[model samples]
Target: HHHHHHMVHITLDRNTANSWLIISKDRRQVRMGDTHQNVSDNKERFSNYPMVLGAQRFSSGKMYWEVDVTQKEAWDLGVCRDSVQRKGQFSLSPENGFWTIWLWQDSYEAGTSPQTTLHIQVPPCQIGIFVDYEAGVVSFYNITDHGSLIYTFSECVFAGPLRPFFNVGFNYSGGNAAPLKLCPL
Candidate 1:
């Protein structure tokens, strides 16, 4: 069977906020979570709300069925100064592990300036995205266009603070429209 999919548009002004899009066997919803960061003292946000679709909230023994992330814009996708202490959405639990698929700073170490573009494959299912943070790398995953794996980013950190938007329905090329089955895997 074939299905359609699209990118979930997200906008987070600060590291303290997050955005999400949840999708599952039933319905779908989008949410933004705002909370204080444990170490950075910043509030994080979520692209979509939690416990809506198939997404399992952050828990010790909970495992995720699937996960993925894409850089919407240069600002939100890049690394910046406060990144070390700044807030980024990541899985809190070690249950499923994580994978960050986007451009990374050239430096292997974090908290550096003048970032570049490189693909980073981290552990767990926590996909880390930084503003102004550059690693000079970008890995093209199977964008869930119109299929099971279409428009979906795999390898996610299934831990606490794992804010992600669900894909109950595929997003269209435009902002608000949903596309038909275009790319199905």
Candidate 2:
């Protein structure tokens, strides 16, 4: 079993949110917006990606957090190097500094260079992301299925700070408009 001694209660960082995404006042939820809102041209903001970064950064230690993706047809949850690409289109792969698992067309795939498909017996409503910075390891857990191990990205080489990564793929005629909810410890 993966250790979860350090539970992080992270809030979303709006300054880094994509202009097309809406962040809740409590900073614990995020959803796609119908149109782009006027936002700062800060380099931290995402211009082409519908994503957001966590308020805190992890440089070292073991950290764990869970995000609720229940009923959402498309979404992404994991961590990314602070220096990862923020502008233009980039593959959601480890080479791009992103270690994540995404849901698309009912498929659970890791953001590896060539993509790794995951077969989960019981679909998880909430996914737990665990990171061991010093060890350069990232693990995705099926929280809804009693912490069942789902996937793990090991032998990772982190160059800088890693922030929680989140993405709610386009809202399709209210089909996938459910707000991505962050679960606090």
Candidate 3:
């Protein structure tokens, strides 16, 4: 049988520059440094999240969750699960420039697959991020679910055998960066 343990949740800030996402299977810490990579094209999206680097997910079942100060724009920036593996594994594009979520498989080559797409309605305030591994889903909620879904992805391979890497950033909608926070459930 498999076992799980609650890890000490830590928050990294501007001073730290980065944090390590560590995990242990049987008293030995999992190596996650090698899996790290960046997913941003524009440098402006870097400040989208308070802590750009931190312990996210080092294993398949772990959830690397974070928030972004999202604004009304054409593309919403998000953390890439793996830059190398994502070469053609997914696509994120919003239609009508309404600030929605997009996803594709095997590459970011084309914005296809509506079943795995999500559209998030931009509210007049900050947004919250909720990612669940067990359910294989990533969702953006309006603090109270009053507005439309910011984004969503399904049939996700939460974690793989190798340590998973994620990059934090914004969507580059040409708006202010929304404040973000990480918490445990």
Candidate 4:
């Protein structure tokens, strides 16, 4: 509800993405490309996942951003700890340094340790992410539905700096081929 005052610009950090995740030149959109493009390997790179991170880092204070999933069906968005493992066998959970939510085959869920099912009357085309570091809360808002509350992760233990995270799931016969776009305030 108080999203405006806590907003921040989020740009996709290409340096952290695997070549298979094609981040647009403007860095506003990200999607899985037909083939992996050659890119340098580094510690920041997510070589095993079709995921990307935002350039902005949050260690203290409030932070908020939005993502466009209007054309997407399978996707994941939220915040991740800077030190969290991103290679093979890494899973998303609060204990795993990830506080996120995802859409899978028409079902919405919070990516908690065991996961929680979210029941939304209407699917959101755009979603808002609000974070309050000192309060240790991370919330997801449904922008298309008058910014009503979707879900919130409270009492989070942020071990380090957190960055916006995005993931575009596998494109099933072009079903989820559309890119996930970062929205401007």
Worst 10 residues of 4 by lDDT: 83-92
Off by over 4 Å in 1: 1-25, 29-55, 67-161, 165-185
Better model by TM-score, 2 or 4? 4
Instruction: State each model's CA lDDT, in order.
Output: 0.25, 0.89, 0.32, 0.89
- Per-candidate TM equals 0.23, 0.95, 0.39, 0.96
Question: Considering lDDT, which of the candidate structures 1 and 4 is the better prediction for this target?
Answer: 4
- List model 2 lDDT by residue over 5-70, tens digit each: 788888999999999888999999999988887776788897787899999999999999889998
- The ten-residue window of minimal lDDT in model 3 covers 103-112
**Residue-wise C-alpha lDDT for candidate 3, range 145-165, written one tens digit per residue:** 553455565555534322212
- Who is ahead in TM-score, 1 or 4? 4
lDDT of 3 at 161: 24
By TM-score, is 2 or 3 better?
A: 2
- In model 3, the Cα lDDT at residue 59 comes to 36
| Candidate 1 lDDT tens digits, 111-168 | 1122223333432222322111022221222334321221122233222333322222
Residue-level lDDT tens digits of model 4 in 75-146: 989999988786776778999889999999899999987899997898999999999999999999999999
Clashes of 3: 14
